[PDB]
Amino acid sequence: EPQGGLEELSGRWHSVALASNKSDLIKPWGHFRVFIHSMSAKDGNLHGDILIPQDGQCEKVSLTAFKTATSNKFDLEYWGHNDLYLAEVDPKSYLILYMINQYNDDTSLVAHLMVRDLSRQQDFLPAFESVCEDIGLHKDQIVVLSDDDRC
């Protein structure tokens, strides 16, 4: 159903790059080194299936980004509480989000770039660098992913 535009984010996506102030969150074995499979908008929430690399196999997990009164802002409960923000989106090609993670009085920032088509994996790296700079992360805090990293 139409949901103010959110429905166009549904379907298959592919993770291209991660960034964080805390490198251990996104480097090998990190809590936020997880990849998108697909999303579906329902009731104004974003429901997603993610893939968690287990070094060999991968596990598929379902999560709900709960809508809030602020648009583009969602609650996501995963390794603590996350305030999730949709930063820059073209539903036909790419999506950039970032999260403020809260885990036992510690906070971290994590950003994520996904695309519809991996042939476009270079095209939005500059856009991702720019969003990262806007939220206070530097280019050396970005991890670019490849087929060898993904599930």
Side-chain angles (χ1 to χ4, degrees), residues 2-151:
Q3 291 160 78
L6 196 68
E7 72 285 352
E8 303 261 47
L9 284 61
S10 302
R12 289 287 274 102
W13 290 96
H14 303 98
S15 294
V16 171
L18 303 171
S20 182
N21 70 295
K22 181 177 180 174
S23 61
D24 284 347
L25 295 180
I26 60 170
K27 289 281 183 167
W29 315 114
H31 295 153
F32 290 84
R33 191 186 179 92
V34 296
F35 315 123
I36 192 65
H37 177 86
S38 57
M39 299 192 185
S40 65
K42 194 189 178 282
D43 309 296
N45 307 128
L46 277 177
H47 301 103
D49 286 345
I50 63 164
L51 302 164
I52 303 172
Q54 299 177 299
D55 209 332
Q57 310 184 331
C58 296
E59 183 187 9
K60 187 181 279 194
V61 172
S62 298
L63 297 170
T64 294
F66 294 78
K67 70 194 183 188
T68 72
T70 303
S71 211
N72 95 302
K73 178 182 187 274
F74 300 81
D75 293 323
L76 183 81
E77 320 303 342
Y78 181 80
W79 283 104
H81 174 71
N82 305 282
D83 296 313
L84 185 149
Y85 295 91
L86 300 178
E88 190 177 310
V89 189
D90 178 341
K92 296 195 175 304
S93 61
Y94 79 108
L95 184 155
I96 300 167
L97 63 82
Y98 65 92
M99 289 173 283
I100 304 164
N101 177 74
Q102 300 126 258
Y103 189 84
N104 292 323
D105 289 5
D106 288 357
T107 51
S108 303
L109 184 60
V110 177
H112 195 127
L113 165 68
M114 61 186 69
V115 299
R116 293 294 195 174
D117 179 359
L118 283 166
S119 74
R120 304 206 67 181
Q121 63 183 353
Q122 175 68 62
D123 291 347
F124 306 106
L125 289 179
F128 190 58
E129 290 202 33
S130 185
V131 168
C132 283
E133 290 177 357
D134 292 342
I135 67 176
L137 300 180
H138 64 261
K139 68 173 270 174
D140 300 332
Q141 300 181 300
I142 298 170
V143 170
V144 180
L145 300 167
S146 68
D147 280 338
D148 216 15
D149 300 311
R150 281 186 294 265
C151 296

